[PDB]
Amino acid sequence: DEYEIIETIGNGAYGVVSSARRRLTGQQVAIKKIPNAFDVVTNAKRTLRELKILKHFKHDNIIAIKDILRPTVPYGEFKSVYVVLDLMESDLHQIIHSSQPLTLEHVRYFLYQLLRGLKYMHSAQVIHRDLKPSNLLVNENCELKIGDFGMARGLCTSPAEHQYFMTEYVATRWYRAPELMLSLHEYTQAIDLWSVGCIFGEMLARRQLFPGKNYVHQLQLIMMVLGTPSPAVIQAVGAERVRAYIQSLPPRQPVPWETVYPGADRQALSLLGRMLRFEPSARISAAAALRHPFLAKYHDPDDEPDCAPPFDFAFDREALTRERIKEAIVAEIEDFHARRE
Ligand SMILES: C[C@H](NC(=O)n1nc(N)nc1Nc1ccc(Cl)cc1)c1ccccc1
């Protein structure tokens, strides 16, 4: 055979995977099994989206497909997909919430890598929409790689999907941007920068910034630090009940970040304040955040590429049956092997 299994291991971005090694080279890899991959439309579409996205990117701070196993059995019998990935022993969740060191320099280095990968991803017109410490994989050499692209979308989405109307269900509550919570009809790469700010804050205090218990409590926590949202953002709130709830509340001023995180690094808090804004268009971009004095130690524009050409989500807006999706996944596996040799 081509690979030798070592052990079943946990993974922040993809759950249960197998640590393995290539028999000829001894190279360590992670092997992810997607069992019964073609049984449910929503799961099958997600597998296709993830394969396409990961094949499009070629960046050290984004998880790479190292190999995809070809069907060894008849087409009709091909039911499970095996993807060979970079082996990542940990993730930012496990590091932050452990007894491991996490100095300002760890924060600065992890933030840098995350923003480096985002700058490249964002130039490809891809919004991750689910950034959280658990899907930011970290290996033994301290390399951070963004994983778990199931929630990723472009600047344009199909009305046929439920999330197009129900934005407050997009991704993880604790990292979910105000435009998603409130349906502000402005959904860009700025969604990711709110999540980055939440992650940045979490590394600084080694605790979640807005750990909301439910929908309303999540907004309350955000408002406790950011203050009452402006009249223009309140008018942009889609739902009348939420809009009335926000308007019913007494006015509140923003709490300076120097009060949220007492004695924290000045340049860190400066960049943090540029990320955590109610208004999507007021947030700093990944590219400009890389130009902030806080990351100057690592910042090198010649070593921080963009992704050309942009990624197209058109294949995902198509209404395809489970069989047609299986056909497209099988074509992706073939294309992967054809492009190598
Ligand atoms: C969160 C995880 N799901 C998961 O990894 N999925 N699910 C689908 N449809 N596709 C993938 N992963 C995937 C697809 C392509 C590539 Cl290149 C890499 C990974 C899960 C783990 C255990 C139990 C339930 C869910």
Side-chain angles (χ1 to χ4, degrees), residues 1-23 25-57 59-71 73-212 214-234 236-340:
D1 211 272
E2 235 285 281
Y3 303 93
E4 184 201 28
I5 311 292
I6 296 152
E7 57 178 336
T8 288
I9 51 151
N11 185 278
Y14 304 107
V16 47
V17 307
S18 294
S19 72
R21 61 155 50 90
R22 198 175 160 191
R23 290 193 181 270
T25 63
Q27 270 142 20
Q28 279 210 113
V29 290
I31 300 176
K32 174 67 190 175
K33 179 184 185 165
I34 310 145
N36 305 313
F38 322 116
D39 280 5
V40 178
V41 168
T42 194
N43 265 278
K45 275 179 98 58
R46 195 247 152 127
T47 303
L48 182 62
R49 168 191 320 127
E50 193 125 38
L51 290 170
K52 290 194 111 307
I53 290 176
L54 302 188
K55 278 175 69 183
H56 191 80
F57 300 148
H59 195 276
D60 293 328
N61 301 116
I62 302 175
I63 210 75
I65 292 160
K66 287 281 182 275
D67 188 24
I68 314 163
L69 309 188
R70 286 183 202 87
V73 291
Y75 180 87
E77 280 169 47
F78 185 60
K79 294 198 177 284
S80 300
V81 182
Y82 297 90
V83 185
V84 177
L85 302 161
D86 292 304
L87 174 54
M88 308 298 286
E89 296 90 339
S90 197
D91 59 64
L92 209 51
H93 171 78
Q94 298 199 75
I95 298 161
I96 293 163
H97 305 276
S98 68
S99 296
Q100 285 200 27
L102 197 77
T103 74
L104 183 53
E105 297 306 328
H106 286 82
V107 181
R108 194 198 314 282
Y109 189 52
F110 288 137
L111 193 65
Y112 173 72
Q113 297 187 76
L114 167 62
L115 292 164
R116 195 175 171 260
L118 282 180
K119 169 182 190 283
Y120 174 95
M121 183 198 309
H122 289 176
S123 62
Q125 268 114 264
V126 173
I127 318 155
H128 187 283
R129 307 198 312 162
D130 194 32
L131 300 167
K132 55 193 177 182
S134 76
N135 53 36
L136 304 178
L137 308 176
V138 184
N139 71 13
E140 282 288 299
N141 280 41
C142 208
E143 297 149 19
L144 181 151
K145 293 179 193 289
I146 302 162
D148 183 18
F149 286 87
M151 290 286 171
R153 296 303 183 278
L155 295 169
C156 174
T157 48
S158 180
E161 70 180 317
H162 76 265
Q163 290 177 310
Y164 181 84
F165 293 101
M166 297 158 244
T167 64
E168 76 278 9
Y169 290 99
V170 169
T172 309
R173 183 202 308 132
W174 296 346
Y175 307 92
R176 186 189 291 129
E179 59 271 38
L180 296 175
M181 286 294 289
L182 303 165
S183 297
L184 301 179
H185 289 93
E186 208 201 322
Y187 317 115
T188 64
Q189 297 99 319
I191 280 156
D192 288 339
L193 272 297
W194 173 271
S195 300
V196 172
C198 290
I199 300 167
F200 189 10
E202 195 167 336
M203 289 198 273
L204 290 174
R206 305 189 78 162
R207 61 158 163 82
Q208 290 85 354
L209 172 57
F210 302 124
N214 49 56
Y215 182 84
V216 168
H217 190 234
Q218 186 68 33
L219 298 168
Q220 281 171 231
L221 293 178
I222 294 165
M223 285 176 205
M224 282 307 290
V225 163
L226 270 69
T228 292
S230 80
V233 300
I234 299 164
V237 174
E240 303 92 294
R241 277 190 184 194
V242 198
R243 194 162 69 248
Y245 169 74
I246 299 155
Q247 281 170 331
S248 77
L249 248 59
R252 231 192 117 86
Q253 280 299 130
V255 165
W257 292 103
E258 308 85 78
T259 302
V260 179
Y261 302 104
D265 181 71
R266 186 172 144 99
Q267 294 290 12
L269 295 186
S270 172
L271 182 52
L272 182 67
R274 298 282 343 259
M275 288 173 184
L276 299 179
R277 307 271 257 270
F278 279 120
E279 301 88 358
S281 75
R283 303 188 193 122
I284 191 149
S285 64
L290 287 164
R291 313 198 304 260
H292 193 278
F294 182 69
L295 305 163
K297 178 178 212 81
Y298 296 119
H299 175 56
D300 175 355
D302 179 67
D303 203 52
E304 294 158 16
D306 275 346
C307 180
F311 183 84
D312 193 1
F313 271 97
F315 69 91
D316 189 58
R317 299 179 214 116
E318 287 176 55
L320 297 177
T321 58
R322 284 173 320 147
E323 196 44 56
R324 297 192 178 265
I325 298 159
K326 185 182 172 172
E327 294 193 346
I329 287 162
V330 169
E332 284 309 312
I333 296 166
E334 292 178 346
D335 171 83
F336 178 89
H337 291 288
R339 272 162 139 86
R340 290 211 310 194

